[PDB]
Design a protein around this nucleic acid. Sequence first.
DNA 1: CAGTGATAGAGAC
DNA 2: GTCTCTATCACTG
Length: 66
Amino acid sequence: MKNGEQNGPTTCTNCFTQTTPVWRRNPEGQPLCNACGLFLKLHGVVRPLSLKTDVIKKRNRNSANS
DNA sequence: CAGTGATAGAGAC
DNA sequence: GTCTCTATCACTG
Ligand SMILES: [Zn+2]
């Protein structure tokens, strides 16, 4: 809305992924995509980035409760 | 309105 | 038949 285009300089320094449902941050201030943030923070150890992909699978949606 | 942390499901071999 | 990774939800300021 405020921006005329979604484009931007934001790039995942861990997997170069320029597309993601949400941008995460690290106590270093370096930008990270949602996957690296979730995987890197949970794993804490390097893992073949060859897993990353330029396509994101859309999952279903369901309220946690109620 | 946006972002985070936590939990669970699905896919491929 | 089993394992792993990733996304989405709800809540708060
Ligand atoms: Zn990334």
